[PDB]
C-alpha cells in the first residue's frame, strides 16, 4: 500500500508514572510539558526512503503555529527546540518514538494527528488526544519547584488543613482537595474554557495558558460566581436559605462536581476558606504548586490608604459604618512560580485570592502578587498589591460615633493588630507553619514602619495623657454552645487620683468577617478605683440569650466602653468562639487497600432538649468515592449516638477522613481522622 498507520500504543501507564500524573483517576493520557513521552506506532510496512511522517498537535478552537497552539514536526533523528519526535528504533513495521513538547507549551487538552507523505501523496489521520499540564519537576519550567518533599506537599497531596478561629484560639479544619478524584482534573480544565477571557477571544486565551501568572489570575476569577457564573456563590449574611451553610462543606470535590453537573451554575454557598480550598484544588490539578494561607485580623481596605476604620457608639455597640472592615481571619492561596514580568527577586510564592472582595480590571479577581514584593512594600507591581498589603498590614483606627449629636471622634490607632499568625499547613504533617515573617517585617521594628511609609508613598488630633484606666476582658471557664458564657472585665487605675469609671458593655453575635447579626446582652456598671486598684466585673450570658442569634461561626463580640471624667473613652474588645459538642470518628480495624474498614462516629447531645434533622456527611480521597450521607435519628436530651459505616480504601498512604454533623441546634460540627492505609 501507500505507507499508512495501523495502530498506536500510547504506553499510558508508563508515561503517566514518568510524568508524575499517575494518581489522577482517569483513563486519559496525562502528561507534563517540556518532558518526552514514548509511543509505539505500527505501520502497514517499513518506511520507504521517499517517505516521511509529520506529527501535528493542536489545542483549543483556533490553533495557530505562531501562537504555539499548533505544532507541525517531522519524525526525525533530532530534537530541534519546540515540539519534536525522535525515531528511537524500527523493528519490522513498528516505530519506537519519543515525542516532546516545549517547556513553554500552553497547558490543556491536545489532539495529535499524523500526516504521511508517500508515493507523491499526502494523507492525514487523527491519532488521539492527551492532556498537558505544568511541570514542577522540570528545572526550566516557570513553575519548577526543586525540593522533592515540598513538591509532594504542594502538588501531590490531596488532603489538607486550613487554620481558622481567631488570634485568641487558632483552630483547624480538614479539607479534601481531591484533585485526583473522578472528573476533577477535567472540570478544572473546563474552568479555563468558560472564563470571560475564553468567551471573548478563545485564541488569545488558549495561547496564554502557557503562563502560570495568567492561569492563576483566571482561576482567581472563575472560582467565584461573580461576573462569569463561576464555581462558588459567596454569602456572609448568616442566612443560607437555598443552599449549604458555608461551614458544612468538607472539600472541593462536591463543589466542583455540583458546578459542572448543574450546567456550570454557581454552587451555594461559600466563604473564604471554601473559595481557597477550591482554588487550591484547581492549582494543584493543573500543576501549579500551591498552598492555603490564613491571615488573622485581616483588613479590607476599600479606599487604598492602608488604614481601616472601626466604629463604636458610647454605649459599647459595634457599628456597621464605613466600607472598610476587619475579619477575624481571611483565607487565600499562594502559587509557586517565577515572575518574568517583575524579575528574578520576585519569584516564588504568589498570592492568589478567589474570594470576591475588590474588582481588579473590572472583575472580581486577585493576584498574582509577589509575597516577597509585599513584604518589601513594592505595591506598584502587578497584581493587586495595595489590597493585599492592607490585608496583612493595614493600620486600624478606632472611632467613637454618637448619631444623636452626629459627632465622630478618633479613639486610637493600632499599627500592630492587623495581620497576625499567618498560617499554612506544614510539609508532611498537620503542624501549623507561621509565615507572618514572609509577609511583613516584625511588628515593633523600625523596618516595619519604614516599609509602611514606603507603601503608603506609592499609592488635627491632640495626643492626650496616657489613660488612667486600662482594661481587658478574660474568659472564665468553658465556652461551649449550650453553656452560659462567663467573662470578667478587669480594670486598673494607673493615675494618682481616685477615679470613677463608667462602663457600657454589649455582646453581639457576628459572622467571622465582622458582620453584625444581633445584640444578645448588654449591661452598664460604675466602678470607683483607688490609685493602683484593679477590680473585676463579671459578665454572664445565658444559653437562652444567645441561642437564637448565634450563627455557625459560634462567635460573640463583647465590648466594654469605659470612661472617666475629662479623659477619652477606653474600648476593651474581645471576640469569643464557643466550642461545638464533641464529634469523633474512629476506625475499628487497620485500614488496608481494597478491604472494607468499619468506622464509628460518636456524638453526645449536651442539651436538655432533643436534636433533630441529624445528618452525617463523610468524605476523604482514597477512603471513599464521593460523599456519604447518613440520616441519624432524633437524639433525646443528653443522649449519645453511635453510627457505624464501612469505607473502602483505594490508595495506600496517610489519608484523611472528614465528617460534618448537622442538626437543628448545631450546624456544621466537624471531625477529622488521619487514617494510615496499608498495602
Amino acid at each position, epitope marked *: 500500500a501507500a505507507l499508512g498507520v495501523q495502530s498506536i500504543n500510547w504506553q499510558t501507564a508508563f508515561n503517566r508514572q514518568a510524568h508524575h500524573t499517575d494518581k489522577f483517576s482517569s483513563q486519559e493520557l496525562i502528561l507534563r510539558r517540556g518532558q518526552n513521552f514514548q509511543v509505539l506506532m505500527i505501520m502497514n510496512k517499513g518506511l520507504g526512503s521517499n517517505e516521511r511522517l509529520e506529527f501535528i498537535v493542536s489545542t483549543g478552537p483556533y490553533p495557530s503555529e505562531s501562537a504555539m497552539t499548533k505544532a507541525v514536526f517531522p519524525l526525525s533523528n533530532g530534537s530541534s527546540g519546540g515540539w519534536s519526535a525522535v525515531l528511537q528504533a524500527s523493528n519490522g513495521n513498528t516505530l519506537t518514538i519519543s515525542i516532546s513538547s516545549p517547556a513553554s507549551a500552553p497547558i490543556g487538552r491536545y489532539t495529535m494527528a499524523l500526516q504521511i507523505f508517500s508515493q507523491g501523496g499526502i494523507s492525514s489521520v487523527k491519532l488521539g488526544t492527551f492532556i498537558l499540564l505544568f511541570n514542577p519537576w522540570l528545572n526550566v519550567d516557570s513553575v519548577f519547584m526543586g525540593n522533592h518533599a515540598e513538591r509532594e506537599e504542594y502538588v501531590q497531596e490531596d488532603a489538607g488543613i486550613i487554620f481558622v478561629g481567631s488570634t485568641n484560639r487558632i483552630g483547624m479544619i480538614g479539607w479534601n482537595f481531591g484533585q485526583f478524584e473522578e*472528573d476533577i482534573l477535567s472540570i478544572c480544565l473546563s474552568i479555563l474554557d468558560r472564563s470571560l477571557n475564553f468567551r471573548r477571544d478563545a485564541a488569545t486565551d488558549v495561547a496564554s495558558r502557557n503562563d502560570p501568572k495568567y492561569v492563576g489570575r483566571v482561576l482567581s476569577a472563575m472560582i467565584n460566581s461573580n461576573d462569569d457564573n463561576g464555581v462558588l456563590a459567596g454569602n456572609w449574611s448568616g442566612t443560607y*436559605t*437555598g*443552599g*449549604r451553610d458555608p461551614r458544612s462543606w468538607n472539600g472541593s470535590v462536591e463543589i466542583l*462536581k*455540583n*458546578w*459542572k*453537573k*448543574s*450546567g456550570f*451554575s454557581p*454552587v*451555594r*454557598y461559600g466563604q473564604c476558606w471554601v473559595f481557597a480550598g477550591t482554588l487550591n484544588t484547581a492549582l494543584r490539578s493543573l500543576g501549579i504548586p500551591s498552598r492555603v494561607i490564613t491571615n488573622f485580623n485581616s483588613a479590607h481596605d476599600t479606599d487604598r490608604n492602608l488604614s481601616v476604620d472601626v466604629y463604636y457608639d458610647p454605649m459599647g455597640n459595634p457599628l456597621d459604618k464605613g466600607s472598610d472592615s476587619v475579619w477575624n481571619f481571611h483565607v487565600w492561596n499562594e502559587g509557586w512560580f517565577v515572575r518574568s514580568d517583575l524579575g528574578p527577586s520576585y519569584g516564588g510564592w504568589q498570592v492568589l485570592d478567589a474570594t470576591p472582595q475588590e474588582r481588579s480590571q473590572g472583575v472580581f479577581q486577585c493576584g498574582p502578587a509577589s509575597v516577597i514584593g509585599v513584604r518589601e512594600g513594592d505595591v506598584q507591581l502587578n497584581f493587586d498589591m495595595p489590597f493585599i498589603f492592607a490585608e496583612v498590614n493595614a493600620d486600624r483606627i478606632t472611632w467613637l460615633y454618637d448619631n444623636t449629636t452626629g459627632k465622630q471622634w478618633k479613639n486610637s490607632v493600632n499599627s500592630h493588630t492587623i495581620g497576625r499568625y499567618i498560617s499554612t499547613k506544614a510539609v508532611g504533617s498537620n503542624a501549623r507553619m507561621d509565615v507572618t515573617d514572609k509577609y511583613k517585617y516584625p511588628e515593633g521594628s523600625d523596618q516595619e514602619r519604614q516599609v509602611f511609609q514606603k507603601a503608603l508613598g506609592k499609592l488635627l488630633e491632640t495626643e492626650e495623657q496616657e489613660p488612667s484606666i486600662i482594661g481587658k476582658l478574660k474568659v472564665a471557664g468553658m465556652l461551649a454552645v449550650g453553656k452560659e458564657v462567663n467573662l470578667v472585665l478587669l480594670l486598673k487605675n494607673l493615675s494618682r487620683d481616685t477615679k470613677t469609671v463608667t462602663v457600657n458593655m454589649t455582646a453581639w453575635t457576628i459572622i467571622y468577617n465582622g458582620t453584625l447579626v444581633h445584640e444578645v446582652w448588654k449591661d452598664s456598671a460604675t466602678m470607683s478605683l483607688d490609685p493602683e486598684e484593679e477590680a473585676e466585673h463579671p459578665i454572664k450570658i445565658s444559653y437562652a440569650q444567645y441561642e437564637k442569634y448565634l450563627k455557625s461561626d459560634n462567635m460573640i463580640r463583647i465590648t466594654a466602653v469605659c470612661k472617666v471624667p475629662d479623659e477619652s473613652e477606653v474600648v476593651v474588645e474581645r471576640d469569643i468562639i464557643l466550642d461545638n459538642p464533641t464529634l469523633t470518628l474512629e476506625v475499628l480495624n487497620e485500614a488496608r487497600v481494597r478491604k472494607p474498614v468499619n468506622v464509628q462516629m460518636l456524638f453526645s447531645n449536651p442539651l436538655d432538649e432533643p436534636v433533630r*434533622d441529624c445528618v452525617l456527611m463523610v468524605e476523604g480521597s482514597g477512603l471513599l*468515592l*464521593g*460523599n*456519604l*450521607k*447518613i*440520616d441519624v435519628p432524633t437524639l433525646g436530651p443528653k443522649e449519645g449516638s453511635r453510627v457505624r459505616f464501612d469505607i473502602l480504601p483505594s490508595r495506600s498512604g496517610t489519608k484523611q477522613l472528614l465528617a460534618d454533623f448537622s442538626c437543628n441546634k448545631f450546624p456544621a460540627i466537624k471531625a477529622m481522622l488521619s487514617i494510615d492505609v496499608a498495602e
Partner: antibody
C-alpha cells in the same frame, strides 16, 4: 421524615380548570426546588414542572406549557399546579416531589407524595 | 433536549446480578447527574441512586449505579437479586431546564 400530601384531584371536563395543592413538612421547604410529575395508569413517569427554591426559575414540559402554572407559598409550606385547558391526555396520577439537591441547580426527586388522581373526560 | 432510552424489560434468577441501561440520545451522559427510582404497583416511586452512583440512607449495598461515557449510558446494577427486587425501575437526568425520565424497565426475578 419528609411528608408531601397532594390534593385537589378529581373528574373534570376537557377545557375546564383544576388546581392541585401539595403540603410539605419535615424539611426546610424554602431550601429546595419542587416538582410535579405525573403518571397515566399503567404508563411511565412524565415530568410536568419545576419551581426553584426562591421561585425565580420555573420550567414546564412542552406538553403542558402555556396551560399549566406552578407556584409555591413559603408561609404555608405548599406547592401548587393550576391546570387550565385540560385534555383527556392529562389524565394521570399527579405526584408532588421534593428535589434532592441543596445549593445547586441539578434536579432529582428524593421524596414523592402518594399523588392525587386527575381524570379528564366529557 | 434529549431522551433517555432503557430496555423494556430485563430478568434474572434469584441470587444473580442484573443490569438496566439508560442511554442518553444527545449530549454527554456525564454532563448531568443521573438518578434511579424503584416503583412497585400501587406505590409512588422511591429513589435508589442519586448523583450517578451514590446510595440513599436505607438502600441496600446490592444496588449500585454507574456511568459509561463510551456508550453514553448510565446503569443500575442489582447483585444478589431477591424476589422483592421485582419492580419497575426508571432512570432520570436533566439539562438546565427540563427533567427527563427514561421510559422504565420491568425487572422480573425469574420464578
Amino acid at each position: 421524615e419528609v411528608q408531601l400530601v397532594e390534593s385537589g384531584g378529581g373528574l373534570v371536563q376537557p377545557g375546564r380548570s383544576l388546581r392541585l395543592s401539595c403540603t410539605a413538612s419535615g424539611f426546610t421547604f424554602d431550601d429546595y426546588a419542587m416538582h410535579w410529575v405525573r403518571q397515566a395508569p399503567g404508563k411511565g413517569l412524565e415530568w410536568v414542572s419545576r419551581i426553584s427554591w426562591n421561585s425565580r426559575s420555573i420550567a414546564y414540559a412542552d406538553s403542558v406549557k402555556g396551560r399549566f402554572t406552578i407556584s409555591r407559598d413559603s408561609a404555608k409550606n405548599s406547592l401548587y399546579l393550576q391546570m387550565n385547558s385540560l385534555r383527556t391526555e392529562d389524565t394521570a396520577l399527579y405526584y408532588c416531589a421534593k428535589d434532592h439537591y441543596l445549593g445547586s441547580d441539578s434536579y432529582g426527586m428524593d421524596v414523592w407524595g402518594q399523588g392525587t388522581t386527575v381524570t379528564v373526560s366529557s | 433536549n434529549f431522551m433517555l432510552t432503557q430496555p423494556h424489560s430485563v430478568s434474572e434468577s434469584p441470587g444473580k446480578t442484573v443490569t438496566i441501561s439508560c442511554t442518553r440520545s444527545s449530549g454527554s451522559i456525564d454532563s448531568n447527574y443521573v438518578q434511579w427510582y424503584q416503583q412497585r404497583p400501587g406505590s409512588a416511586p422511591t429513589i435508589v441512586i442519586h448523583e450517578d452512583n451514590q446510595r440513599p440512607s436505607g438502600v441496600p449495598d446490592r444496588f449500585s449505579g454507574s456511568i459509561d461515557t463510551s456508550s453514553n449510558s448510565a446503569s443500575l446494577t442489582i447483585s444478589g437479586l431477591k424476589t422483592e427486587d421485582e419492580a419497575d425501575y426508571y432512570c432520570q437526568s436533566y439539562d438546565p431546564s427540563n427533567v427527563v425520565f427514561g421510559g422504565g424497565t420491568k425487572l422480573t426475578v425469574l420464578g
